[PDB]
Amino acid sequence: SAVLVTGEVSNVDLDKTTITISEDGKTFNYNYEEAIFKLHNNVVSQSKFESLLFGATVTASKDDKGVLTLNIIDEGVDALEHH
């Protein structure tokens, strides 16, 4: 499960299910539609994940089969709180 990046979520687009993750001045973009979602390594639903996603710290990783996992390390807030 190669790690792609660990860092802060920005630019959350819930409609397009896309995020940007930033680490060390670099930006990584993901469509999380088909991702496995975790919260402190606990598997969770998309909805739960999105509820804590804005400004979250997330690790993005991919197994040998190309399946994307997005794990919230440090909790963000929901779309409505973010405003």
Author numbering: 766 to 848
Provide the authors' original text about this structure.
Cell surface layers (S-layers) form symmetrical lattices on many bacterial and archaeal cells, playing essential roles such as facilitating cell adhesion, evading the immune system, and protecting against environmental stress. The S-layer is built from one or more (glyco)-protein subunits, S-layer proteins (SLPs), that self-assemble into a highly flexible and dynamic lattice through an entropy-driven process, allowing for structural adaptation in response to changing environmental conditions. In this study, we introduce the SymProFold pipeline, which utilizes the high accuracy of AlphaFold-Multimer predictions to derive symmetrical assemblies from protein sequences, specifically focusing on two-dimensional S-layer arrays and spherical viral capsids. The predicted models were validated using available experimental data at the cellular level, and additional crystal structures were obtained to confirm the symmetry and interfaces of several SymProFold assemblies.
